[PDB]
From Swiss-Prot:
<dbReference type="GO" id="GO:0033081">
    <property type="term" value="P:regulation of T cell differentiation in thymus"/>
</dbReference>
<dbReference type="GO" id="GO:1905360">
    <property type="term" value="C:GTPase complex"/>
</dbReference>
<dbReference type="GO" id="GO:0050900">
    <property type="term" value="P:leukocyte migration"/>
</dbReference>
<dbReference type="GO" id="GO:0060021">
    <property type="term" value="P:roof of mouth development"/>
</dbReference>
<feature type="domain" description="DH">
    <location>
        <begin position="178"/>
        <end position="368"/>
    </location>
</feature>
<dbReference type="GO" id="GO:0098978">
    <property type="term" value="C:glutamatergic synapse"/>
</dbReference>
<dbReference type="GO" id="GO:0035264">
    <property type="term" value="P:multicellular organism growth"/>
</dbReference>
<dbReference type="GO" id="GO:0001782">
    <property type="term" value="P:B cell homeostasis"/>
</dbReference>
<dbReference type="GO" id="GO:0050853">
    <property type="term" value="P:B cell receptor signaling pathway"/>
</dbReference>
<dbReference type="GO" id="GO:0038095">
    <property type="term" value="P:Fc-epsilon receptor signaling pathway"/>
</dbReference>
<dbReference type="GO" id="GO:0140693">
    <property type="term" value="F:molecular condensate scaffold activity"/>
</dbReference>
<dbReference type="GO" id="GO:2000973">
    <property type="term" value="P:regulation of pro-B cell differentiation"/>
</dbReference>
<feature type="domain" description="N-terminal Ras-GEF">
    <location>
        <begin position="562"/>
        <end position="706"/>
    </location>
</feature>
<keyword id="KW-0344">Guanine-nucleotide releasing factor</keyword>
<dbReference type="GO" id="GO:0045742">
    <property type="term" value="P:positive regulation of epidermal growth factor receptor signaling pathway"/>
</dbReference>
<dbReference type="GO" id="GO:0042129">
    <property type="term" value="P:regulation of T cell proliferation"/>
</dbReference>
<comment type="subunit">
    <text>Interacts (via C-terminus) with GRB2 (via SH3 domain). Forms a complex with phosphorylated MUC1 and GRB2 (via its SH3 domains). Interacts with phosphorylated LAT2. Interacts with NCK1 and NCK2. Part of a complex consisting of ABI1, EPS8 and SOS1.</text>
</comment>
Length: 1007
């Protein structure tokens, strides 16, 4: 009685160990695909199925297990598996121990097996289980990567299974054409293309290069013909295309890739494509080819390398070599889509220069492909509505709907079954074979089927192998098929033309898998052989390894964890992650540039990014010296494979953070004249091929800023409300006063004024309490400028009140100020609103009972409304702000208060092993708050600025040349004068204003 899989006895012991572990394996093969618990719960059921049959043989030693593996597991999967499991016993260095919980599997093994086993045996068993787990995810991951889905599901796992012959032997739109999308699409296509290239180079071409005595130099050329060159180009192009996008900020319609093509086209890099397109479409190509796998030694070497290898190299490789053609033709038809949909002038200029330089190459192939022979090979190599028609075309079909096991049809032709009376039309489908007898034109009885065809039987199409010989006997252009538990059927064709057609699609299905597998094995192997030493930690500080005393990460923030994030760490490590060669982080670069002045200085940062930029190259070996001035020179090629792949990412990001720097921090270089000087001189030293583009990028921005500082008047969308005139004629700045100017006009101008101030505020001025530092004027020019405004305005209000001795007039004044509040409220100017509340809560005013008595009851409710904005920690206010759309002027007070609580609630540094790490968590938390500030800086108000009035409020000097304390006392003293205490009589003060005291008021004009 084999051990149950559920298991009916022990169920919660086989479902809570695999799912959590396999999720990590998927990130090892395809770090670009998402995990799905549903899919992972299906894989564990497969891995468990394997664990049973392996324990059936009941091995007691690590040697008895190997036997069961070589027998059950097909080839060559059994040879690579035993090589991996052995690596576990050799105790040799490995990426990581068995991902799957070994201490969870070990006890359960002795239960299923039935007896005691050494720990060395268990590890060997799980080792195999690991190789198989990763093998399934590696396969299904490929298909998900090909269909461009980016997500894996339990469903697509089944599809990849059926496509196999090994795993089945053991387990048994879019009309839209946006400019940005085509780039992301092409980049996805070129990635698949490059993968196919590596398949042709490291799987097909490698064997011909390995065996020299059989295949010579020119012998290989006659087959592939400059295929490597095409690869080195696609990589570079894929490089510059990923770099241009990585440099494109969010404030841009689309990356400028036009310059990229211009460089390659100017160098005529698309020439090897022409040489290739010819050597492949030649009339005498297939001849030299087929006459290459027939020569002595060839037919035997192909088989030794792998089983079924020969069949694909002869009936598939030719079709794979046609890819670079269609690929190259795709560029031309794509560049034209760029010039048409280019949103930039300078960009479109580089597009024309590219297409023009590729006219000779385009016109070339456009005529090479139009050949009477070449054109016939192109159309050949080139839901669901089709399957229903084909299934319908079948009469009395006894199988399950074709769509049960088939998603597509490969080809449709005719063949003659040996021992078969009539030629059978054949429908080709993935995982299925269809045979029918034609009855076209033949008479039928009324009511009987009218279908053209008639099919007797069907085949699985899994695990079938074909061998053919154009024998003396009446067998020609035929293939051999082995029915399971059945005699093989020979299928003949009319000519070799169709023979290759069938052999193509057929061999491709069952053989494609072996390729993708052998490719991943090779690629992975190459990365291991290439030993790369980390830069000397003595000459390069950023090279020092990572630990728990120089850098920290958070587990909470990220479960995968996926994208890494840092809690704290020294400035060195911080900059390392700021320009981490492996991956690029946009969020971190933004945050860092906003909150770096709290623990690092501008001059300091510049000096550090330079150190990070310039990296000492590994000293050439002794043999490189004698050859550095002579032929047969190393050329440091082995070093370039790392230098080029390390320098680029590292230095690219150094120029990236340096790009954002000179764009969103132009004030830093404006504050220190020497800082900018260093910047322009550091760029001058930066030299290189593609480095020019990014250099011109930085320089262009720097010049753009300088011309911005020197000498505006932007326009907005209609329509601006007509300005409201006051009792005093326009232009008369002298008569300007609270009662004189028109209520709503005053609010508009103050709203504009306070809005610019708010927008001007840089999130930097609010980090590390730089406004509290003695050097407040330097770090927070805008913040302070805003604060001073609120003070002056509020004071001005109180001054307009207490100085109005006459009660009748002071009531008017207070009444007017309340009206101005209303217009702040409707203009979403919460600032000005609360600036009025402050004057109404001031000592000199809050005590004027006699004044606040003679004001309308309708206005009191308006004032009391605002008084409630402060209550409950600005609860009412915060709720109101979230229901408001810009333009609006937020109350800045709330932000300052929170920011403080954050920098006081969190230690500036974290102590680890006596060391001191810069707590970056604070920096982010603060940035989160500063974000809520920028959210409202986007859209300005739609109001026409009036020079005189704007100036008037900019020149507000209530205190005159007095001090805060002095002037405030005076106000309170005037309050005790205009309204004495209860016992003291209330004097009758004369009127000061000799103009109409009646409000307009607060009523916009119809026009």
């Amino acid at each position: 009685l084999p051990y149950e899989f559920f298991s009916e006895e022990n169920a919660p012991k086989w479902r809570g160990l695999l799912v959590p572990a396999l999720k990590k394996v998927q990130g090892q093969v395809h770090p670009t695909l998402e995990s799905n618990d549903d899919a992972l719960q299906y894989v564990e059921e497969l891995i468990l199925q394997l664990l049973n049959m392996l324990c059936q043989a009941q091995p007691r030693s690590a040697s008895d297990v190997e036997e069961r593996v070589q027998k059950s597991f097909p080839h060559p999967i059994d040879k690579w598996a035993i090589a991996d499991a052995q690596s576990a016993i050799e105790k040799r260095k490995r990426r990581n121990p068995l991902s799957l919980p070994v201490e969870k599997i070990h006890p359960l093994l002795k239960e299923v097996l039935g007896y005691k086993i050494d720990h060395q045996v268990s590890v060997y068993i799980v080792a195999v289980l690991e190789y198989i787990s990763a093998d399934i995810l590696k396969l299904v991951g490929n298909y998900v990567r090909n269909i461009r889905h980016y997500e894996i599901t339990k469903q697509d796992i089944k599809v990849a299974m059926c496509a196999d012959k090994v795993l089945m032997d053991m387990f048994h739109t879019s009309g839209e054409q946006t400019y940005y999308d085509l780039v992301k699409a092409f980049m996805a296509e070129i990635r698949q293309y490059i993968r196919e290239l590596n398949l042709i180079i490291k799987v097909f071409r490698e064997p011909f290069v390995s065996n020299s005595k059989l295949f010579s130099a020119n012998d290989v050329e006659n087959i592939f013909s400059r295929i490597v060159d095409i690869h080195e180009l696609s990589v570079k192009l894929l490089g510059h295309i990923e770099d241009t996008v990585e440099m494109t900020d969010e404030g841009s319609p689309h990356p400028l890739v036009g310059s990229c093509f211009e460089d390659l086209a100017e160098e005529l890099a698309f020439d090897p494509y022409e040489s290739y397109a010819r050597d492949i479409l030649r009339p005498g190509f297939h001849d030299r080819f087929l006459s290459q796998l027939s020569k002595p030694g060839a037919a035997l070497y192909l088989q030794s390398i792998g089983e079924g290898f020969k069949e694909a190299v002869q009936y598939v490789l030719p079709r794979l070599l046609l890819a670079p053609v269609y690929h190259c033709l795709h560029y031309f038809e794509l560049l034209k889509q760029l010039e048409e949909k280019s949103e930039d002038q300078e960009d479109k200029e580089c597009l024309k220069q590219a297409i023009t330089a590729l006219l000779n190459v385009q016109s070339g192939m456009e005529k090479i492909c139009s050949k009477s022979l070449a054109k016939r090979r192109l159309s050949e190599s080139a839901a669901i509505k089709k399957m229903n028609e084909i299934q319908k075309n079948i009469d009395g079909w006894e199988g399950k709907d074709i769509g049960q096991c088939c998603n597509e049809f490969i080809m449709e032709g005719t063949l003659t079954r040996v021992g078969a009376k009539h030629e059978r039309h054949i429908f080709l489908f993935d995982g299925l074979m269809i045979c029918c007898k034609s009855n076209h034109g033949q008479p039928r009885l009324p009511g009987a089927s009218n279908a053209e065809y008639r099919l007797k039987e069907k085949f699985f199409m899994r695990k079938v192998q074909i061998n053919d010989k154009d024998d003396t006997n009446e067998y020609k252009h035929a293939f051999e098929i082995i029915l399971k538990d059945e005699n093989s059927v020979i299928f003949s064709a009319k000519s070799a033309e169709e023979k290759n057609n069938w052999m193509a699609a057929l061999i491709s299905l069952q053989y494609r898998s072996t390729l993708e597998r052998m490719l991943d094995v090779t690629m992975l192997q190459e990365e291991k052989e290439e030993q790369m030493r980390l830069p000397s930690a003595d000459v390069y500080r950023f090279a020092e390894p990572d630990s728990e005393e120089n850098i920290i990460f958070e587990e909470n923030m990220q479960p995968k964890a996926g994208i890494p994030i840092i809690k704290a760490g020294t400035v060195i490590k911080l900059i390392e992650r700021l320009t981490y060669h492996m991956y690029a982080d946009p969020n971190f670069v933004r945050t860092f540039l906003t909150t770096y002045r709290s623990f690092c200085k501008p001059q300091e940062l510049l000096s550090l990014i330079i150190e990070r930029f310039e990296i000492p190259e590994p000293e050439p070996t002794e043999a490189d010296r004698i050859a550095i001035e002579n032929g047969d020179q190393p050329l440091s090629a082995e070093l370039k494979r790392f230098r080029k792949e390390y320098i680029q990412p590292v230095q690219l990001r150094v120029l990236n953070v340096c790009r954002h720097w000179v764009e969103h921090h132009f004030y830093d270089f404006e504050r220190d004249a020497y800082l900018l000087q260093r910047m322009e001189e550091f760029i001058g030293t930066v030299r290189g091929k593609a480095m020019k583009k990014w250099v011109e990028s930085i320089t262009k921005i720097i010049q753009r800023k300088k011309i911005a500082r020197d000498n505006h008047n932007i326009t907005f969308q209609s329509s601006p409300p007509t300005v409201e005139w006051h009792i005093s004629r326009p232009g008369h700045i002298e008569t300007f006063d609270l009662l004189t100017l028109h209520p709503i006009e005053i609010a508009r101008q103050l709203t504009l004024l306070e809005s610019d101030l708010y927008r001007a505020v840089q999130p930097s001025e609010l980090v590390g309490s730089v406004w509290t530092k003695e050097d407040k004027e330097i770090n927070s020019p805008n913040l302070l400028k805003m604060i001073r405004h609120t003070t002056n305005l509020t004071l001005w209000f109180e001054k307009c009140i207490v100085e109005t001795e006459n009660l009748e007039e002071r009531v008017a004044v207070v009444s007017r100020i309340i009206e101005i509040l209303q217009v702040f409220q409707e203009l979403n100017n919460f600032n000005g609103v609360l600036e009025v509340v402050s004057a109404m809560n001031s000592s000199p005013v809050y005590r004027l009972d006699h004044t606040f008595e003679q004001i309308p009851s309708r206005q009191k409710k308006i004032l009391e409304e605002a008084h409630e904005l402060s209550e409950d920690h600005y609860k009412k206010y915060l709720a109101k702000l979230r229901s408001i759309n810009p333009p609006c002027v937020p109350f800045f007070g709330i932000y300052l208060t929170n920011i403080l609580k954050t920098e006081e609630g969190n230690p500036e540094v974290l102590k680890r092993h006596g060391k001191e790490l810069i707590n970056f968590s604070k920096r982010r938390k603060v940035a989160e708050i500063t974000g809520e500030i920028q959210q409202y800086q986007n859209q300005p108000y739609c109001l026409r600025v009036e020079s005189d009035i704007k100036r008037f409020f900019e020149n507000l000097n209530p205190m005159g040349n007095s001090m805060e304390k002095e002037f405030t006392d005076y106000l309170f003293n005037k309050s005790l004068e205009i309204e004495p205490r209860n016992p003291k009589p209330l004097p009758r003060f004369p009127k000061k204003y000799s103009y109409p005291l009646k409000s307009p008021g607060v009523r916009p004009s119809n026009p």
